[PDB]
């Protein structure tokens, strides 16, 4: 079968460069050009351009001239793409594809100057005051890099939960989670937030106390 192997995720510094690879197998590399597509997280798709392995001919989207450089190696059926002068704007997932039917798994590029930083975890109890349903929260701030895994009572309490996608703060991330239970259940019982940040090998547990 046609297979397109792309290089692992890249965490690089602004201003520098990065060169990803796309190794083709399962077909004749020189029988098709190799297109590259950019996708900024949660958004659209953009055609960067292509390289014809046979004669090294290229065609670029004027928007990416100078930013991207496409090259190819016939000896190993491997195409490459080099991004120069990175900025957070270049953070995205890059794909290679010989034609519409077969795309690589993509290469994630994250352009940032941050260092691994464990998250600050704060419990979110309701304002002093009651109805029959309570909503409790947990806010994890300023961590890096992604991701973190949050659970409630270790994973037992998983209904009525909403964990929101992380978003950039400074060049640090911030995410939150809310779980709603009947007030008959809280604070009579227990409810604690479990935040694990695999990058700093930290797992914090903060339990929600009434104010």
């Amino acid at each position: 079968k046609v297979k397109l192997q792309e290089s692992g995720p890249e965490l690089v510094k602004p201003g520098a460069s990065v060169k990803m690879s796309c190794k083709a197998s399962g077909y004749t590399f020189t029988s098709y050009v190799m297109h590259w597509v950019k996708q900024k997280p949660g958004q659209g798709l953009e055609w960067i351009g292509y390289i014809n392995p046979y004669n090294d001919g290229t065609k670029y989207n004027e928007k990416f001239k100078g930013k991207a450089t496409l090259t190819s190696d016939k000896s190993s059926s491997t195409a490459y793409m080099e991004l120069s002068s990175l900025t957070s704007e270049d953070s995205a997932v890059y794909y290679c594809a010989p034609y519409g039917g077969y795309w690589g798994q993509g290469t994630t590029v994250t352009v940032s100057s941050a260092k691994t930083t464990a998250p600050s975890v704060y419990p979110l109890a309701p304002v002093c005051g009651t109805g029959s349903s309570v909503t409790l929260g947990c806010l994890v701030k300023g961590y890096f890099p992604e991701p973190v895994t949050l659970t409630w009572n270790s994973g037992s309490l998983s209904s009525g939960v909403h964990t929101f996608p992380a978003v950039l703060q400074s060049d640090l991330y911030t995410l939150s989670s809310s779980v709603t239970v009947t007030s008959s259940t809280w604070p009579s019982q227990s409810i604690t937030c479990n935040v694990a940040h695999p990058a700093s090998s930290t797992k914090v547990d903060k339990k929600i106390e009434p104010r």
């Binding site: 659209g44 798709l45 039917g101 795309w103 419990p123 304002v127 964990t163 809310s178 903060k206």
Partner: protein, 218 residues
């Protein structure tokens, strides 16, 4: 630059219904060689786009025949006779006839359900964060439908956007509603120069904003 406008940008349907997506090119996409390279893609979260239709109306290997494509010259349409759950995701039309090749903005095929107002909760800064010198005010807007919504913060009556970070969840897997978290971060100093913190949510299920609020010195 051939721009590809697809309509709608969001398409709610009920399992079993029909689904039609439109895509029109700002100009003819007949390639010099005589073919029309208009394609349709479906992409699921954390995955790469999968080809469904190529050359206007040709199904790619393994693609179910309830998917069909048609149109010509400048107007193209993708139709799903009866929507299944593996069909939910983002669709794209694409043209590979004129460089720069371009994609449509995408159409998210999501699930239809009954309108539901958001359950609004507001949370003052935790004692911990305040001890650390920071002050975040959180406001959750949960379990609403449809997805379009807007949150507005008011500090002592003053509208505030500087320092507000929002995040939206994908359509819930169980009840098909949407949620949102809005967080206002100030410094403790700043936080203490004020008393009333308010988050208003205007959603289509009402012309009147649902407002939650608290007075700091209470």
């Amino acid at each position: 630059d051939v721009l590809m406008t697809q309509t709608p940008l969001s398409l709610p349907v009920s399992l079993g219904d029909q689904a039609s997506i439109s895509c029109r090119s700002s100009q003819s996409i007949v390639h010099s060689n005589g073919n029309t390279y208009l394609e349709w893609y479906l992409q699921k979260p954390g995955q790469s786009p999968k080809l469904l239709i190529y050359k206007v109306s040709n199904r790619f290997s393994g693609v179910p025949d309830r998917f069909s494509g048609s149109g010509s010259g400048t107007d193209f349409t993708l139709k799903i006779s009866r929507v299944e759950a593996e069909d939910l995701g983002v669709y794209y039309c694409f043209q590979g006839s004129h460089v720069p090749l371009t994609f449509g903005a995408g159409t998210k095929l999501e699930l239809k359900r009954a309108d539901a107002a958001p359950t609004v909760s507001i949370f003052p800064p935790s004692s911990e964060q305040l001890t650390s010198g920071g002050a975040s005010v959180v406001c959750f807007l949960n379990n609403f439908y449809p997805k379009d919504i807007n949150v507005k913060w008011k500090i002592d009556g003053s509208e505030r956007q500087n320092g507000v970070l929002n995040s939206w969840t994908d359509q819930d897997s169980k009840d098909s509603t949407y949620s949102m978290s809005s967080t206002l971060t100030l410094t403790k100093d700043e936080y203490e120069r004020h008393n009333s913190y308010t988050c208003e949510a205007t959603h289509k299920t009402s012309t009147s904003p649902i407002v939650k609020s608290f007075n700091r010195n209470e």
